[PDB]
């Protein structure tokens with residue numbers, strides 16, 4: 009019973025203190041790490057001992073067994089690697105205490121420090137042969153086995169148990185950090201300058217989403233958490249930082265599911281004198297090279313339908329297909345979506361397409377939401393075997409994107425999808441301040457109908473446009489979703505160390 | 513003159529250009545070379561030399577307009593913090609593209625332009641682009657301020673882009689900031705440390721003593737606190753076996769704003785399993801000495817502590833730095849004895865009376881930790897200005913997450929590093945006995961019950977460090993968009 013277990017262990021701690029022993033020593037000076045130990049002594053022969061080499065090593069005990077009264081065996085793990093501990097009565101320093109009393113105390117989970125020599129057992133298992141083993145920090149609960157952590161929510165609420173017991177968990181999070189490292193180096197090598205912009209602002213603009221609100225007490229001031237980094241980054245382009253980017257958290261106050269956590273990690277970059285076509289190329293270069301950097305090939309396996317179903321192969325070899333959103337919806341639905349797309353007639357037509365196909369009506373049935381819903385069900389799963397771009401979005405869906413230089417009513421916008429999930433959003437940046445105020449005014453008229461995700465107008469941002477924003481191309485990436493596909497995860501909670509959870 | 517009228521005339525110019533068939537905001541100009549690359553490639557030209565057969569496309573912002581008659585127009589063109597001259601001569605103008613004077617008469621200071629031309633140097637020797645054709649790419653519709661207009665004003669903070677265009681030193685301050693963070697990340701990574709992201713919104717805000725921001729998630733129907741530190745989930749990852757772990761990111765404190773306090777600021781915290789207080793003292797001297805030498809090529813720097821209108825002091829980052837035990841120094845400087853327990857009525861009253869004796873400000877509430885803090889602030893924290901130094905061995909009542917001192921009762925194995933009286937670092941041997949932790953977050957307390965190895969952890973205030981290494985007196989000068997009182 010776990011509860012009695014914990015109580016006996018706590019009593020043990022107290023009783024050890026009462027006898028004069030410190031169960032939590034301040035410092036043990038380690039000589040070698042467990043990965044270093046494996047590298048150095050892997051080449052030893054079966055049964056070879058180096059008894060003149062005395063080492064101080066630490067780690068977490070993960071298995072306890074005995075062979076008689078003079079032999080105790082353990083697994084010792086550290087930094088994701090494992091060695092055996094072979095405690096023989098014949099090598100024990102009896103001046104430190106009784107052998108059996110010393111090792112009877114150890115439990116699965118204890119952190120220990122060992123003074124001993126390296127070698128391999130007769131079977132051939134690389135081992136540390138202790139002369140003395142010291143408790144550094146007890147595990148007071150029973151550690152679960154892999155089956156206890158398998159199909160549970162414990163991994164999200166006690167991530168440390170997952171990291172200790174599931175080898176795949178460590179690897180997922182190492183890949184996540186490698187992906188971010190690769191992206192930072194990719195941009196820095198191309199002259200980009202990393203900055204930090206405020207997470208708390210008077211307005212939350214740069215995307216269409218409901219924000220979190222907070223309050224600064226001394227200023228008696230309500231502030232919004234940022235939903236995107238787009239607006240202050242473009243003001244820095246005005247300021248002459250012509251290649252600027254930010255990798256950090258944004259906050260969106262909306263529904264939670266397998267591809268939505270309320271805080272998530274984005275990268276946005278802004279590139280003065282680039283356009284749509286440079287951004288398409290950047291995306292293909294970046295994703296193809298990232299995948300090759302991680303896997304040595306451009307093709308990966310992904311269990312789109314979970315581990316109980318067949319996986320699919322995703323090929324990141326460029327180029328990727330491009331699909332124009334309005335043209336394709338018109339072809340697949342056999343309708344003509346007349347401009348203005350936000351006219352009453354086009355809105356009624358899109359509603360009827362949705363109702364005819366038994367699709368859910370967006371809670372406010374705005375033209376921009378109607379089109380999004382249509383693309384979701386008719387386009388975004390056109391390709392699963394390769395990423396692809398949906399391109400040339402209407403201006404009503406894209407209030408900060410520059411008008412399309414040859415197609416009226418559209419913009420120079422691209423979104424990349426992997427397995428039906430949006431991972432990238434980019435466009436030629438709107439830089440005419442007179443057209444920008446018009447877009448914000450139209451977004452206000454859409455807010456008046458009950459749209460809580462209509463981005464609010466930023467007076468400071470519009471003012472910065474009046475000092476001259478050069479022609480610019482900007483791009484944003486969803487780091488968590490990218491990591492999901494590159495670690496074979498179906499849930500954003502599997503690639504975030506501490507996902508947003510209700511209290512226990 | 514009249515800034516409002518200027519903007520109205522420029523807005524009419526944009527609209528009139530559109531009416532005449534010209535697009536004053538073209539979609540794409542394909543540049544051949546940047547302004548820094550131009551200076552590098554053609555700096556070695558000779559006085560008066562032209563390379564008329566090499567045609568380049570270049571872009572930038574016009575920052576000065578002057579003329580020598582109608583046939584020679586001169587401009588300053590800036591990009592990426594560097595500048596060249598533009599020499600528009602009627603004799604080289606491509607008249608097939610339009611009328612010369614009609615073209616250049618339109619240019620105003622601040623305009624972003626694209627130039628097709630050739631490189632060269634003037635007779636006097638000024639490196640120049642010689643346009644055959646110039647195109648407007650994005651107009652500046654307002655009059656730019658003078659450097660004098662940005663000097664003592666909040667325009668630098670409320671329109672930071674004007675500060676970056678007009679003050680060359682501003683770009684330099686933020687480049688140094690990014691170099692500082694790049695250095696720290698590399699320093700940690702080369703030593704085996706693993707960078708992570710922990711939540712900014714939590715059910716509890718712990719890891720420091722500060723009032724938090726509160727927000728609400730609508731669909732979970734849940735109040736959440738913005739983090740005041742990264743300490744607690746990072747130690748949970750040490751329990752998880754990530755034995756060298758760190759995070760560089762924003763934390764939030766809902767308190768007063770001043771020259772060293774911005775409500776959001778950038779911290780780095782790292783956690784080092786099997787290290788202790790002594791390892792962290794060495795790390796700190798190793799890191800700051802190597803950081804300053806990396807940036808300056810020397811260990812000594814100049815800092816204008818009392819403002820740019822006063823004499824600068826010299827800060828020597830040569831290690832080692834002095835260590836000052838807080839309690840015994842407060843005792844020495846005041847010739848009192850602070851008997852333990854430090855939270856007894858007798859020791860509290862003595863700290864209160866010594867505060868009253870020196871006419872010092874009295875904390876509300878006057879807890880023992882708050883009293884000890886004020887006494888260190890008034891009596892220790894400005895002991896050294898010529899070098900960074902450490903205050904060490906804080907009482908347990910001030911350090912609920914720090915491990916008890918292995919030989920000194922009532923103290924902890926803690927260190928804080930100060931530069932010019934300002935705290936930039938806080939570190940300690942981590943308390944890992946859950947029995948002592950509860951006496952001092954339920955999910956954090958439970959994780960300790962699974963075994964936290966002996967560990968040393970450390971935090972840095974990135975903005976305050978940047979202030980000292982960029983010669984700034986205010987944190988507003990090292991944050992691109994600092995929190996201001998709304999206009």
Ligand SMILES: C[C@H]1CCC[C@H](C[C@H]2Cc3cc(O)cc(O)c3C(=O)O2)C1
Pocket residue numbers: 260261262263267268269270271272274275430431432433484485486488489500
């Ligand atoms: C910067 C964006 C560019 C490409 C699309 C990405 C969208 C972004 C949308 C989103 C909303 C939300 O409420 C919670 C989430 O986790 C996400 C997410 O992961 O991706 C990111």
Ligand SMILES: C[C@H]1CCC[C@H](C[C@H]2Cc3cc(O)cc(O)c3C(=O)O2)C1
Pocket residue numbers: 765766767768772773774775776777779780935936937938971972973974975976987
């Ligand atoms: C992580 C900490 C380690 C060493 C002390 C530093 C203190 C930290 C305190 C603080 C409070 C505040 O409300 C606003 C601020 O900007 C700062 C700051 O910059 O430094 C940072």
Ligand SMILES: N[C@@H](CCCC[NH3+])C(=O)O
Pocket residue numbers: 214215235236237238276433434435482483484485
């Ligand atoms: N702010 C966008 C990403 C950048 C789009 C191009 N400026 C988003 O939230 O999706």
Ligand SMILES: N[C@@H](CCCC[NH3+])C(=O)O
Pocket residue numbers: 719720740741742743781938939940942969970971972
């Ligand atoms: N959480 C501390 C920094 C780390 C101290 C060592 N664990 C602070 O906010 O000051």
